[PDB]
Amino acid sequence: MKFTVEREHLLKPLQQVSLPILGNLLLQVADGTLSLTGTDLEMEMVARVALVQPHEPGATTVPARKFFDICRGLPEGAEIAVQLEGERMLVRSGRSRFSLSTLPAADFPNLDDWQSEVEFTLPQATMKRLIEATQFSMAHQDVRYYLNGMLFETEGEELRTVATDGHRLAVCSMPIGQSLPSHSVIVPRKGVIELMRMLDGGDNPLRVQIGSNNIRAHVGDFIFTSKLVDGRFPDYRRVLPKNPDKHLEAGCDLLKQAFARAAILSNEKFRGVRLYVSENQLKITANNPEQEEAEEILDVTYSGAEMEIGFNVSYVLDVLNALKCENVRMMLTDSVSSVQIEDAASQSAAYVVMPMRL
Amino acid sequence: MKFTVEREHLLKPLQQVSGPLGGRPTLPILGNLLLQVADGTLSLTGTDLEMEMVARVALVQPHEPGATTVPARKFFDICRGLPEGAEIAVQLEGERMLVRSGRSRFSLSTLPAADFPNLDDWQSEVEFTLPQATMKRLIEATQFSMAHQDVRYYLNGMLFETEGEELRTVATDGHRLAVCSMPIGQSLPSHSVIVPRKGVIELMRMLDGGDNPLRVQIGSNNIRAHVGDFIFTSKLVDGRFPDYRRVLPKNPDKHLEAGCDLLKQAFARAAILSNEKFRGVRLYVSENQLKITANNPEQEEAEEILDVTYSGAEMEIGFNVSYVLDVLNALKCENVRMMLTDSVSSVQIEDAASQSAAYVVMPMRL
Ligand SMILES: CC(C)CCC(=O)N[C@@H](Cc1ccccc1)C(=O)O
Ligand SMILES: [Ca+2]
Ligand SMILES: [Ca+2]
Numbered sequence: 073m074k075f076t077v078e079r080e081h082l083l084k085p086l087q088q089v090s091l092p093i094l095g096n097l098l099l100q101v102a103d104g105t106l107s108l109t110g111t112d113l114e115m116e117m118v119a120r121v122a123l124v125q126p127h128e129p130g131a132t133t134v135p136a137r138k139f140f141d142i143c144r145g146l147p148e149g150a151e152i153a154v155q156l157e158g159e160r161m162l163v164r165s166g167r168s169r170f171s172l173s174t175l176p177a178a179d180f181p182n183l184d185d186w187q188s189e190v191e192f193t194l195p196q197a198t199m200k201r202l203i204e205a206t207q208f209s210m211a212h213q214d215v216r217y218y219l220n221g222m223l224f225e226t227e228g229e230e231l232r233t234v235a236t237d238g239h240r241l242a243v244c245s246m247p248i249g250q251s252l253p254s255h256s257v258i259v260p261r262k263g264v265i266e267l268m269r270m271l272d273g274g275d276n277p278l279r280v281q282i283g284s285n286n287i288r289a290h291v292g293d294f295i296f297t298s299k300l301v302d303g304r305f306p307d308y309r310r311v312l313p314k315n316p317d318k319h320l321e322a323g324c325d326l327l328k329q330a331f332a333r334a335a336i337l338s339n340e341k342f343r344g345v346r347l348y349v350s351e352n353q354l355k356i357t358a359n360n361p362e363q364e365e366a367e368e369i370l371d372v373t374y375s376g377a378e379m380e381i382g383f384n385v386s387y388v389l390d391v392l393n394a395l396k397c398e399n400v401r402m403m404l405t406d407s408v409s410s411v412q413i414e415d416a417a418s419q420s421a422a423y424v425v426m427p428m429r430l
Numbered sequence: 431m432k433f434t435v436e437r438e439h440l441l442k443p444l445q446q447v448s449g450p451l452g453g454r455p456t457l458p459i460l461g462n463l464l465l466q467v468a469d470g471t472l473s474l475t476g477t478d479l480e481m482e483m484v485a486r487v488a489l490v491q492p493h494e495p496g497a498t499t500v501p502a503r504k505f506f507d508i509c510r511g512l513p514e515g516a517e518i519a520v521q522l523e524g525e526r527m528l529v530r531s532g533r534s535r536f537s538l539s540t541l542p543a544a545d546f547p548n549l550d551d552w553q554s555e556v557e558f559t560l561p562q563a564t565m566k567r568l569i570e571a572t573q574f575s576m577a578h579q580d581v582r583y584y585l586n587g588m589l590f591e592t593e594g595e596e597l598r599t600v601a602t603d604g605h606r607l608a609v610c611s612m613p614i615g616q617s618l619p620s621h622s623v624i625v626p627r628k629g630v631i632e633l634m635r636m637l638d639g640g641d642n643p644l645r646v647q648i649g650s651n652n653i654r655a656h657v658g659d660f661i662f663t664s665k666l667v668d669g670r671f672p673d674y675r676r677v678l679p680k681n682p683d684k685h686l687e688a689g690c691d692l693l694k695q696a697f698a699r700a701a702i703l704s705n706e707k708f709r710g711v712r713l714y715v716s717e718n719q720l721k722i723t724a725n726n727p728e729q730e731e732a733e734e735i736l737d738v739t740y741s742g743a744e745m746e747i748g749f750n751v752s753y754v755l756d757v758l759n760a761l762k763c764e765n766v767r768m769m770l771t772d773s774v775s776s777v778q779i780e781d782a783a784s785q786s787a788a789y790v791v792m793p794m795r796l
């Protein structure tokens with residue numbers, strides 16, 4: 073295996089792809105192409121680079137971080153020459169020389185072959201919107217493994233994401249402009265994070281392939297694959313309040329800043345605030361073990377019956393930070409029922425949050 | 431005690447005087463700021479018992495005198511969290527201090543101003559003014575070489591030395607040393623004092639970057655710095671710092687000069703394949719050439735060849751590459767001079783264009 077390539081052409085590929093052998097990148101030269109693969113057994117990223125300079129086919133594996141750091145550490149405009157010599161891989165550029173250890177390409181974990189069942193293309197921006205709208209509501213290390221991740225659901229012409237931790241839920245639906253089969257899978261949180269990471273903000277569309285046990289995403293000359301998670305993910309439709317009769321509308325940023333200020337004097341371990349809704353007004357209060365008190369009064373749009381209800385501060389701020397909008401609607405039922413929160417100008421996403429007793 | 435101040439006039443003072451406060455204040459009052467209204471000025475003070483930072487805020491709105499202490503983090507977060515240009519009205523009510531702005535209201539627990547720790551009065555024995563940039567240069571040139579939580583307590587601070595028309599800082603951890611001298615244009619008596627770790631941090635923190643000069647006062651047991659409307663005071667560390675003059679190699683007759691960035695980037699790349707704990711690289715110096723090598727127990731190898739200026743005898747010497755990189759990062763210059771003796775002796779490293787800063791690094795046993 074031998075190739076010479078500009079550092080420039082390796083930088084982005086290495087960034088995306090980076091048991092001892094799982095700390096190594098697979099390098100493969102074949103058919104005028106260098107392929108680079110990184111994996112952790114649960115997911116893999118493959119990147120390809122074209123090779124115009126003389127090259128020789130073959131494959132080996134090398135320490136991912138060290139190889140990346142060496143390539144990154146070389147000067148801008150550097151040419152990187154690589155040749156395989158037994159148990160070492162030689163890397164040369166200018167008068168900088170490196171010998172890295174290797175493990176055989178034959179030993180490299182190959183994620184089992186699988187079969188695509190559902191396929192579609194969508195804009196990068198749509199995937200970004202879907203993930204950012206809901207990712208914060210995924211569970212972290214819940215014993216219910218299937219909540220430590222994100223539901224991806226196809227229905228009609230929409231792709232939908234759902235995330236929940238049992239206390240709050242986020243759902244977002246976006247058009248993809250193709251009639252799609254009804255289907256849903258759970259992508260583990262680490263997979264969701266890497267999927268987000270591969271979206272660079274340009275116009276490259278994403279090609280998605282969903283199998284019975286895997287999901288794959290193609291963008292540019294990168295291919296990402298992740299295993300899926302087994303489980304009965306809850307139905308968001310059953311979580312949405314059936315008949316909210318009390319409607320508050322307020323400035324998103326005004327509400328966010330009032331919550332954030334009040335939270336300063338809430339209990340440090342379980343930060344919550346009490347809301348009192350009455351005619352044209354929201355009052356937010358907090359107190360702590362030291363008997364310190366905060367109070368915020370806001371002029372709001374509200375005409376239903378008076379009620380008091382508590383919320384976990386972080387759950388509400390998480391939603392308001394996700395909304396990034398002018399006005400927010402809160403749809404309430406009673407003091408012991410969950411609340412629905414939405415951007416007043418968008419029906420693409422909805423949030424449900426349990427009340428908190430204080 | 432009463433005052434009303436616009437938000438943005440409080441924020442930076444609050445941030446500044448909170449400098450010395452830790453997370454986990456050992457006792458409640460140490461997490462509080464002293465607020466004092468007197469003679470048309472609000473003063474803010476934070477302390478950790480070793481040093482204090484004080485800010486003076488002019489009061490253009492109606493006020494009443496008095497003093498209390500309140501939780502620093504809560505009070506700052508409240509002020510920061512209010513809308514831009516918010517008028518922050520404060521009224522003391524015994525065990526509580528009330529804060530109001532628009533329709534936002536807050537009640538904070540207080541502790542008596544009379545219990546707030548107050549550094550003893552002391553007497554200045556030397557005073558001088560210097561540009562903020564000069565103090566910045568002095569600290570940045572040497573701070574990285576200070577020890578971290580060493581049982582030899584004096585090493586955890588920074589020596590400040592006045593001598594003739596020069597102010598000098600020195601830092602060392604026993605393995606490597608940094609010294610920087612700068613001119614002040616005022617003839618100073620000889621003083622040598624150790625500023626504690628957090629004190630060095632605060633001195634740096636208070637340099638706004640503008641043209642407000644720094645006024646320094648040093649006593650036998652304290653140091654004080656005045657910048658704008660801030661006054662920083664620290665107790666000095668009670669120890670005898672090593673003399674840097676005795677640590678500088680006596681006659682290194684082997685001189686190497688090379689570009690700083692090329693040397694840095696080569697050391698940085700070589701470091702990748704050095705031992706993860708010991709970080710050893712080897713330097714082979716020969717006529718007009720430096721070869722840097724690293725290897726690790728994975729029997730991986732790095733080699734960097736650099737054109738340098740060197741006329742001395744060939745020699746091989748090992749170094750902790752982190753120590754070398756730290757120096758090169760601190761020098762931030764075009765060319766560097768390395769002054770060598772032998773493979774069992776320290777190297778002296780300097781900007782090739784200025785002797786104002788010098789660095790002494792002990793070699794590694796190969
Ligand atoms: C977010 C919260 C208001 C959902 C409460 C709820 O409807 N829980 C159901 C479904 C569910 C939702 C989220 C996680 C797990 C289960 C249950 O406990 O069975
Ligand atoms: Ca090329
Ligand atoms: Ca991977």
Ligand SMILES: [Ca+2]
Nearest residue numbers: 225227307309
């Ligand atoms: Ca459905």
Ligand SMILES: [Ca+2]
Nearest residue numbers: 436515516517
């Ligand atoms: Ca104002």
Ligand SMILES: [Cl-]
Nearest residue numbers: 434435436439
């Ligand atoms: Cl003011």
